[PDB]
Symmetry: C3
Subunit: 274 residues, 3 copies
């Protein structure tokens, strides 16, 4: 970890003096889900480049969403960009110092569960942190008690209540396709998985595969934030050597557009119940 | 590896000139098992801070245990503290240069095998080194032949004889609960595993999960030491989403106390047969 | 990645001005397969030490093989030597800048599939990149579009045509033992796997285990090279605690000799069909 506690304080102090907004909820927008910030009222935006200590991208937007004061990350950071996890998760700790209590994380992922279909929304019930198995963890290094404990529990990371409410809200939305729910596995990237890797991951019990999120959740749980999140299934991963095609970022961004209005609508409603 | 061969020599030379003790056996005490050093006779202690080149913590204690000359590490180092494995395992190589022939490793672990119960003692028959799958290995870097070979075998790491004797000794102890035996899997930490991760690990064939030991064993085998070890089962990991509770370091330390007298007693007897 | 684009250019320019050879095919020789370079005609060799920017070993040999212009790496680099993957794979990108279109990779591996026998040749149909699960990837860091895309597909890494031709060619060779085909899994090393690790890997769907290759393939696919490869099964890994013996580098090198003439013969013929 290359940031001191004071670094975190300085950055939060800077934000508090540049906007009157006082967020209670923070949202990290995954790839293609950035349009969510366009629904905020009384909004104020800061490019990451203008914020002291912020990792290099990228906009941070404050505002009101369906009655709730929020702060959203339009664009996030990734391990595959070369950033260590202490940089990838720097914003989560700043949010805590701002007074945020709940964190919503979203991402684009590849579907491992055969029952999934492109466009599906999968609530995240649990995760598998592969980089963590080898020590790549945002918490690696001396522990800072002002944030949390040395050995944080992670079995209850994704708030159960929020998931119930989430299912309730989706009911009131009157959607034809059911709201999915499963386990998200994170791996480094940036390349897409081979057939052997996809089969393996599925056998490990994962329902969706991605390249982010997990480190943010771990840090959020460590400092005390309530966590909720979901994945937009952007493609069904190739499970056999009879590959009619192969994963590509184009289709991932395409799928991101088709389900924009939908995803944005869902998150907007969930604010009500927090 | 940031230590030269001379660094290892200098440190061993320093220890040999500050104590008359000449250990044949070395013991690394895991969390909560530190009371073991209190049974040594003609003991001499050195805080790690007073020993040149030693990683920063932490006491090294020399003495006689049930007739055998020993040197024990009261407190060990971990990857989750930010230390690279070449630092975590520095003492093992120093021990070899001191004349030590056998290494006993102990640790606190979470139980994956359903038949295990808190308090159980599980002899370590084999291990799974997850960090090693990605290259995080104390042997990474140019090989130093003065210590061992470039490609060391690890399938016979845990001495079979010692395990037989271990079972024999436990018999003479007249314990009601049987002595367990299984596979130990090491992951980075510092957070506790999620339900998905626990299920996965069990399916990989692991019986107990921890955050240390494996790197020490690998280095000990590389330089020629005989190895024996075991885990104190401090908690039964949550295997379902009907979690009545969740892992916590408090209970781990609590369990460490209840089985202190027992664990300490067992190790004391095992010295006889080496 | 510690090499700039210009570094790659400078090195390729140097090679182009020191030899009249213009390779279309590149071959990376694994351990014990180095004798392959002895069949090249009109050959020219450069020790890696004489080539600007080349990682420290090691010879690069240009020449004609059964009618095809080739460049071969007699000796490769490994993660267990302490080299980051951007160093291990530096040559692959230089080859691309030289005008190479196809890459052949070979290695020595341990057999996981029970049907395999020492000496068997296993064509590589797919792979499992364990280090990649944690982020150790030659592509980690800012993407260089002059080489390839940010998110490269890997499900079609091993050219299907080449595999068909490979099987065809092996037919014309009239060999008694069939040509094997399976999945190669790469782990860091340098130690050999324990029994628990071997069982685990097999259950993940791997047929052979090694310490190289995968990173080279990923980089070759990223910059557009056609890829073909195979493993020489140098030993049957210990799958039970009734180990009659244990893996050793001696036997691996021994097996490498016995199948030299065979392996060398096979590769020589495959050139014809490219
Ligand atoms: N590991 C993996 N990641 C995928 C796949 N499909 C989508 N992704 C995610 O979207 C991008 C590639 O199109 C990657 O970058 C990030 C985007 P995120 O910030 O997680 O929304 O995770 C990966 C996929 O199939 N596998
Ligand atoms: N991975 C993991 N580690 C655990 C668990 N229970 C105990 N541990 C070990 O004890 C501490 C947490 O209480 C951690 O720190 C070290 C202690 P050690 O030096 O291995 O005796 O390994 C972990 C557990 O459930 N999972
Ligand atoms: N992981 C692993 N690697 C093995 C085994 N048998 C052979 N190897 C490979 O050969 C050497 C050890 O003798 C190691 O170094 C490299 C050689 P390579 O450049 O891949 O041909 O991969 C390993 C084996 O059983 N397991
Ligand atoms: Mg800046
Ligand atoms: Mg000191
Ligand atoms: Mg040089
Ligand atoms: Zn200002
Ligand atoms: Zn002195
Ligand atoms: Zn010259």
């Amino acid at each position: 970890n290359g940031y001191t506690y004071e670094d975190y304080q300085d950055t939060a102090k800077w934000l508090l003096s540049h906007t009157e907004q006082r967020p209670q909820v923070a949202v990290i927008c995954g790839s293609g889900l950035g349009g969510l910030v366009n629904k905020l009222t009384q909004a104020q935006t800061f490019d990451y480049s203008e914020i002291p200590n912020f990792p290099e991208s990228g906009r941070l937007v404050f505002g009101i969403l369906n009655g709730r004061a929020c702060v959203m990350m339009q664009g996030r950071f990734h391990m595959y960009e070369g950033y260590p996890f202490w940089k990838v998760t720097f914003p989560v700790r700043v949010f805590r110092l701002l007074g945020v209590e709940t964190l919503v994380v979203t991402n684009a992922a590849g579907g491992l569960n055969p029952n999934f279909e492109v466009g599906d929304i999968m609530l995240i019930r649990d995760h598998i942190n592969l980089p963590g198995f080898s020590g790549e963890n945002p918490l690696r290094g001396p522990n800072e008690e002002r944030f949390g404990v040395r050995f944080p529990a992670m079995s209850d990371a994704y708030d159960r209540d929020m998931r119930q409410k989430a299912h309730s809200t989706w009911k009131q939305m009157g959607e034809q396709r059911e709201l999915q729910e499963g386990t998200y596995v994170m791996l480094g990237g940036p390349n897409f998985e081979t057939v052997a890797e996809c089969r393996l991951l599925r056998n490990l019990g994962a329902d969706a595969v991605g390249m982010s999120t997990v480190p943010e959740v771990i840090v959020a749980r460590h400092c005390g934030l309530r966590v909720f999140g979901f994945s937009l299934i952007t493609n069904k991963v190739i499970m056999d050597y009879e590959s009619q095609g192969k994963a590509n970022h184009e289709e991932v961004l395409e799928a991101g557009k088709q389900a924009a209005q939908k995803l944005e609508q869902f998150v907007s409603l969930l604010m009500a119940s927090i």
